[PDB]
Amino acid sequence: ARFMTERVQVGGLQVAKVLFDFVNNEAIPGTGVSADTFWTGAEAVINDLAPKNKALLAKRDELQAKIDGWHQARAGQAHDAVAYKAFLEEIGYLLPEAEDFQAGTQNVDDEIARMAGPQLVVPVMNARFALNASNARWGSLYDALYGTDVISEEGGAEKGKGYNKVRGDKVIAFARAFLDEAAPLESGSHVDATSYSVKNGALVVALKNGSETGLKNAGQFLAFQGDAAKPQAVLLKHNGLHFEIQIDPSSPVGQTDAAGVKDVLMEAALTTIMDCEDSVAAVDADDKVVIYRNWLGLMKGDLAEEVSKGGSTFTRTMNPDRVYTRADGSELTLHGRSLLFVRNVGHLMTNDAILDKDGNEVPEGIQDGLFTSLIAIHDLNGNTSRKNSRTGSVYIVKPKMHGPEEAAFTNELFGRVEDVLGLPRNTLKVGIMDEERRTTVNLKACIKAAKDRVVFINTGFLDRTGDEIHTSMEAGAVVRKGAMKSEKWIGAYENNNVDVGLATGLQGKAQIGKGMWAMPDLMAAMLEQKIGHPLAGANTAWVPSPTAATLHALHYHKVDVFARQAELAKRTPASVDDILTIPLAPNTNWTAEEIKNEVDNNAQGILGYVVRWIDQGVGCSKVPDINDVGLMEDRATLRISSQLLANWLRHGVISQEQVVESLKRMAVVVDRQNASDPSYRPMAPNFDDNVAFQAALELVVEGTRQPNGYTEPVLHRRRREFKAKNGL
Ligand SMILES: [Mg+2]
Ligand SMILES: [Mg+2]
């Protein structure tokens, strides 16, 4: 028997037993909501909103088909932008710009509304990653520098396995230069400090020449830990972000330092998105329970994992808040943890963890809203040892929405969930991903549809490129994947998001955010390049790891984002006509070598990701590209690569035999790259029977058939196929 799920009858619903029991025995106790109340309300929401959800998806399909037909009816003609835009308007794709308004969201935590800094995104299915992300609010700058390529190993500065002082002295010097910039002394350089102490309410820095100095701006000093005359830490603030100079002259690093400094502790990942979507693989009730159970551990504060470090073992847990003494004897407490959002899945998928009264699968987005909000009640009512929101809000990221009617449906869904759970109206806040064309070109109206719930807008630029390719699939051959960043549309898309965010009053109430740095080991490059995100007026942007959060925090000390937003609020707004410029290749006269490099690079990226998704249920993998650069891959990069190959195939840039040959060749490369993993099974040489290879092949050769180019229908089907065959 194929795909087996044991269910029980719950009113008119059929609920997977594993999920029923998880909700009743783990999520519900401590919320003050009875299981009967919850399940009866859930069934009402499902029965009312599932038909609306289905009609929204039918509308996507209808519009894509009309666009397909529009280009087909104009095969071989030069693109007529004016006729295209009248068509998009007449069919209801491009809607009138929304009337002016200001967002009304209230009760937003400071990390979102009033601060600028990094935002970490991690798969919530991995409890170790989730724990580290919760704790990444504070990060060791010395560890981030010593451990990454920010500091070159040249000149005998190798990391090695111990503490290489040659390297460590470079780390220390980099950090002193940061201190000179972010907390300048009135005289001299932190490089010459011999002592940090507190006297008469001010930081006093003794220098090697025997004099003492204060800070140039003495108000940057806030508080300390330990004795004022010999503090263990001094707490500073700059651009709204905190950092500690940590002092211990008996520590291995401290005893090499004239002032005993052992580290600089940076306030780093202000917020974290615990992901249930593009970075996880969860295809059935068993997988979804694991997801929900980790979110539950975060919301109750008891998420914990045993880890082997040193020779022994200890239990990793969520860190407490941090306590400091002010010079007047009062106590100052800082949040010890990143403020958590949860990313629900979007409107597309259904799953068979719940069947409705007609035996149909229930939309997964509706389920996530019910279950993740139920679980968040543990935070809202204080049934937790680790508070998340201090304002009575839950922060849900809603991805992959197309246009303002779909934003209104999320607003409606969240209100219905609140009613089921007895939550005050607008408790459930929404982070709106701007990552689909129909949202971009209607963005102001999309925000307006959730104007009292909005807590962010963010340019998921990789999904957005995937939608760009699928939407104009029939128009012609698109440019190479690496050429997209220079096309007209994408710069206008990024600027539009900031312009609309500022014009709709998000400042002071929500984040205007930007995308993920996807090269986890190229931290020197990240430090060079990602300053562009705060310079663009985004008060947050995505990083892949706690280390990258610590390093990206340095950018917010170089750029005052809110002041930058004031400047950018004056510029001419981005043009929808630029956004409507389809990234078609001027001609298809690429060198045969150029074509081979594009096909091979996409084929490797697809296969390196898909094999781990299908065989191991891993939704986020680092995959070397054909230059051996390690790329962080999730479903959004798979969407781009599969859709580009489908597009080149559809327009005869490449042949099917060609794409198949490249996939087989790059599969062998992928197998080699994974050969040292004992849990890895190769794809070659039996490609016909290999589920993962067939999944990759389907996404490419049938890329034109996937709804808006989404990869989940194939991945979910094939992962379940693999799980069933192997007893997983
Ligand atoms: Mg905290
Ligand atoms: Mg997304």
Task: Tell me the two tokens of residue 295.
Answer: 């979110």
Task: Tell me the two tokens of residue 70.
Answer: 């529009």
Task: Tell me the two tokens of residue 465.
Answer: 């490129």
Strands 350-355, 304-308: pairing is: unpaired
CA distances from 331 to 129, 300, 402 (A): 32, 26, 48
Q: Taking the domains of the chain in order of start, what are their residue ranges?
A: 1-137+268-588, 138-267, 589-728
Distance CA 723, CA 114 (A): 45
- Name the amino acid, one letter, at 705: R
Residue 559: count other Cβ atoms within 10 Å of its Cβ: 18
Distance CA 24, CA 375 (A): 11
**Do 447 and 453 meet the contact criterion of CB atoms below 8 Å apart?**
no
Question: Any idea how long the chain is?
Answer: 728
Distance CA 710, CA 535 (A): 32
Options 3.40.50.720, 3.20.20.360, 3.40.50.10420, 3.30.1130.10; CATH of 1-137+268-588? 3.20.20.360
Handedness of CA 602, 605, 609, 614 (dihedral sign): positive
Owner of token pair 């950090």:
175
Task: Say if residue 649 carries a ligand binding annotation.
Answer: no
Q: DSSP characters for 646-673? A: HHHHHTTSS-HHHHHHHHHHHHHHHHHH
Owner of token pair 């070397």:
624
Strands 621-624, 630-633: pairing is: antiparallel
- Which residues, in sequence order, are bridge partners of residue 207? 193
Instruction: Return the ligand number nearest the Cα of 399.
Output: 2
Task: Say if residue 463 carries a ligand binding annotation.
Answer: yes
Task: Say if residue 564 carries a ligand binding annotation.
Answer: no
- Which residues, in sequence order, are bridge partners of residue 234? 224, 245
Distance CA 294, CA 291 (A): 6
DSSP type of residue 169: H
- Quick check: helix, strand or coil at residue 71? helix
Q: How far is the CA of 463 from the centre of ligand 2 (A)?
A: 6
Instruction: Return the ligand number nearest the Cα of 387.
Output: 1
Residue 47: count other Cβ atoms within 10 Å of its Cβ: 16
**Do 470 and 633 meet the contact criterion of CB atoms below 8 Å apart?**
no
The experimental method, as deposited, was X-ray
Q: How far is the CA of 431 from the centre of ligand 2 (A)?
A: 11
CA distances from 254 to 142, 165, 181, 247, 249 (A): 12, 12, 22, 7, 4
| Experimental structure resolution, Å | 1.6
Q: DSSP characters for 336-392? A: -SPEEEEE---SS-EEEEEE-TTSPEEEHHHHHHHHHHHHHHHHHTT-SSS---SSS
Task: Tell me the two tokens of residue 197.
Answer: 């102490």
CA distances from 624 to 148, 231, 542, 607 (A): 18, 46, 21, 11
- Quick check: helix, strand or coil at residue 610? helix
Task: Say if residue 128 carries a ligand binding annotation.
Answer: yes
> Is the backbone peptide bond immediately before 96 cis, with ω within 30 degrees of 0?
no
Distance CA 661, CA 652 (A): 16
Distance CA 458, CA 440 (A): 11
Owner of token pair 């009264």:
357
Query: In which element (H, E) is residue 199 found?
Result: strand 193-199
Please compute Rg for the chain using Cα positions. 26
Domain 589-728 annotated CATH 1.20.1220.12: yes
Q: How far is the CA of 400 from the centre of ligand 2 (A)?
A: 6
Residue 422: count other Cβ atoms within 10 Å of its Cβ: 13
Handedness of CA 95, 96, 97, 101 (dihedral sign): negative
Positions annotated as catalytic residues are 343, 634
- Quick check: helix, strand or coil at residue 412? helix
**Do 705 and 266 meet the contact criterion of CB atoms below 8 Å apart?**
no
DSSP type of residue 3: S
Distance CA 7, CA 422 (A): 27
